[PDB]
Amino acid sequence: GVWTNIEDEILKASVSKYGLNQWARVSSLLARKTPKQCKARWNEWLDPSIRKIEWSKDEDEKLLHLAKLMPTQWRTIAPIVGRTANQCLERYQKLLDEAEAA
């Protein structure tokens, strides 16, 4: 289900305690969140290396050049555009959705 501003605060404080690679203990301090869901939420949001600002179109153009160059791998675009792979895939679909509408 959804992630509340409270559950992320418990996730951050729990991650600081048991590190990464310890998600059953991390999940234990949560009520209705699986260990995998905690890994997802830190890998897609809580990690401070993930960007929080809107996509710059400098980042959109970087994403467009590399998706046409290498459509055979998505975890390959990510180490160059400072976002996650799953964020890259979904942002590319939006840029395709917006083009299709025009």
Which method was used? X-ray
Q: In this structure, are residues 91 and 63 in contact, taking their beta carbons and an 8 Å threshold?
A: yes
* Resolution value (Å, 1 decimal): 2.4
Task: Domain ranges for the chain, please list them.
Answer: 1-50, 51-102
Q: What is the DSSP string of 59-88?
A: HHHHHHHHHHH-TT-STTTTTTSSS-HHHH
C-alpha to C-alpha distance for 37 and 16, rounded to whole angstroms? 17
Nearest-10 Cα torsion for 78, 83, 85, 91: -120
Phi and psi angles of residue 18, each rounded to the nearest 5 degrees, phi first: -110, 5
Distances (CA, A) of 84 to 2, 42, 93: 19, 11, 14
